[PDB]
């Protein structure tokens, strides 16, 4: 579920959301802590979900790393509420 009380975009056009986004700011969690130059790239699946690739520079490893995920809408694809599973 979305957190109680929050807005969720309700005319979502997944096709126009596809491609690369820059992470400008985050609340810090151990899964992303220390990563700089973070991007998210979205593409459309045949089964109607999204493929996700999260990329960042890890200045400790001195390396680029990414994690890949599969996202599905929890309702109408015009409601921007999804669940993402990373693998």
């Amino acid at each position: 579920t979305p957190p109680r009380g929050v807005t969720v975009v309700n005319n979502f056009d997944a096709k126009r959301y596809l491609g690369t986004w820059y992470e400008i700011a985050r609340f810090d969690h151990r899964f992303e802590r220390g990563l700089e130059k973070v991007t998210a790239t979205y593409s459309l699946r045949d089964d109607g979900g999204l493929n996700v690739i999260n990329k960042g520079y890890n200045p400790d490893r001195g390396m680029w790393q990414q994690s890949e995920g599969k996202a599905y809408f929890t309702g109408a694809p015009t409601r921007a509420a999804l669940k993402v599973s990373f693998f």
């Binding site: 009380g5 929050v6 975009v9 959301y17 820059y22 700011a25 609340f27 999804l82 669940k83």
Partner: protein, 64 residues
Amino acid sequence: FYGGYNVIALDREYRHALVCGPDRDYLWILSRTPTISDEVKQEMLAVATREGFDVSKFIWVQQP
């Protein structure tokens, strides 16, 4: 590793987005460009505060 992903605000031209996770301890500002304007910055912060998010938790991510 799995969880909710919610676009809570998005401008008309799909250039700027506020995304939250399964509760108010997860929030992200996304942009089509690596830097944003002071004006866009304050609108995003105003919206997050309005919906009960604690904007003091933001880390400003290094970008080229």
